[PDB]
């Protein structure tokens, strides 16, 4: 016998070990094991918490954001910060229009505005505007919260942190340039081993995704792209959107994506209550 | 004759000079001066965008956040990140209820959940949970977006960036400790010249506000406080919420708070479109 799915969930809730591989001689020993591992997890949470109080630090997600951001600035990217609110028009330019099922999966603030489910709308707008002021590439990036109505999963959050980098009019082939920037981010994130895959997408038809052990940590694309007309873009470009919680979760080997980011139940992998 | 209230607004929205003090011999002299200052402003905008493209950098608001954050960590504060969503219950435990004006500024996501108008509810929760693990002060801070419905004002945004620091069970008089850590933040922000004032608050009854030239950049409170029972807090505490865009705007001498914050119309003080 093994841990039940319910026991595995409670263990992952409190601990960041691996539990689904244990095998026991009978239910009695399985249950004794469950108590011992809950006790070990709680103790490890105590130790991490006490360690943070004695040796305070910036937040694990903030540290990752700073690590990647400084690497992108070094490559010539301007950091921008854009509103979390976006308009119905901005969504429509992504083809997220009012009669599509997807329209209802965004958090609406009123009849005209919603919480951004992605940074690309604002990034296209800012990048295009900056093109009015330079003849070279427009390189910008943002790191900020996005919001999506999601079903329960160990890798999905209603609020998650996107990194979106945008290189409009790059100095080379857009796809080769994109793979170069993906490499910069992944190395700066401490995750140099990854795979690139072509993945279907309603908004993009197909994306270039970054996967680690089959887990999506990025969707990317290159221009000239069919979305350019709606954004008044008329040049090649390289763009990529990473999920920072997912990167941090995989690197730190957190049992779930809810432990490394924004929370009032966890702090840097530790359960605090 | 002076610039009209509208002329000021327009000059401020493209430029970062100081126009409210200008005086003019007559309406003709005023009007000609409105155009030249528009041209001086547009030119400076362009130089700023061009300067940013040739010298790319972290965002000004981000640099200010990193400066204060590292200073607070150096004083023993743990950085925490909490969700932007908060429950109707959490708001109620802050006494943010139907009768309070702040309640009418709340952005609701559904009938049970809202965009946080402040970080305090989440900070109380995380700080009180950490008290179970230590016999000393619990020192935490968060920097993140808060949301409020606001009328047109050169120092209000619907989405602004709060810094909230929280010292529960401080070592010293909570009010004296509060003033010390206000000093740490203000100096880290490059704004060493400020004053402290007492102000009325519908949530805290009374706050200690930080002002620069009479402009509020922070509201702070101390415990024991009547909000403590609803947060299971049974000890003194020191708490302060800073408006980071207001700090950045005053230090950089931007004309309004919209120029240095989250925007698709401004970037680091410069207007990027018409
Ligand atoms: N709910 C979420 N929680 C955390 N990260 C997310 C979430 N949704 C998307 N991301 C991340 O954001 C990146 C860019 O967004 P996007 O490609 O549109 O997501 P996605 O394709 O819907 N991913 P998925 O829902 O797992 O199939 C993804 O590659 C993920 O790493
Ligand atoms: N709409 C806003 N835009 C930008 N900063 C804000 C906004 N509301 C509050 N702040 C800042 O956040 C701090 C803490 O919030 P709080 O004291 O509750 O605001 P407040 O009392 O309503 N200030 P004010 O609206 O100018 O009278 C304030 O001292 C401001 O520096
Ligand atoms: Mg497991
Ligand atoms: Mg670093
Ligand atoms: Mg995006
Ligand atoms: Mg999805
Ligand atoms: Mg996927
Ligand atoms: Mg994707
Ligand atoms: Mg107010
Ligand atoms: Mg606050
Ligand atoms: Mg202390
Ligand atoms: Mg005030
Ligand atoms: Mg106030």
Numbering used by the authors:
A (entry chain B): 3 to 275
B (entry chain A): 3 to 276
Q: What does the published report state?
A:
The MaPylRSIFGFF clone was further characterized using in vitro biochemical assays and x‐ray crystallography. The structure of the C‐terminal catalytic domain of MaPylRS is similar to that of MmPylRS and MbPylRS. MaPylRS lacks an N‐terminal tRNA binding domain that is essential for activity in MmPylRS and MbPylRS, and consequently it is inherently more stable to purification, more amenable to kinetic and structural characterization, and provides opportunities to produce proteins containing ncAAs using cell free expression systems (Gottfried‐Lee et al., 2022; Herring et al., 2007; Jiang & Krzycki, 2012; Seki et al., 2020).
Efforts to obtain crystal structures with the amino acid substrate MeHis bound were unsuccessful, and the active site is instead occupied by an exogenous triethylene glycol from the crystallization buffer. As observed in published structures of MaPylRS variants, AMP‐PNP is coordinated by three octahedral magnesium ions, which in turn are coordinated by water and the sidechains of residues E218, and S221 (Gottfried‐Lee et al., 2022). In our structure, the loop harboring residues 199–210 adopts a “closed” conformation, plausibly due to the presence of triethylene glycol positioned in the amino acid binding pocket. Consistent with our in vivo assays, MaPylRSIFGFF can adenylate MeHis with a rate of 0.59 ± 0.05 min−1 at 10 mM substrate concentration. In contrast, no activity is observed using 3‐Pyr as a substrate. Similarly, regioisomeric amino acids 1‐methyl‐histidine and 2‐pyridylalanine are not substrates for MaPylRSIFGFF. These data confirm that the increased selectivity observed with MaPylRSIFGFF arises from the specificity of amino acid adenylation rather than downstream transfer of the activated amino acid to the tRNA.
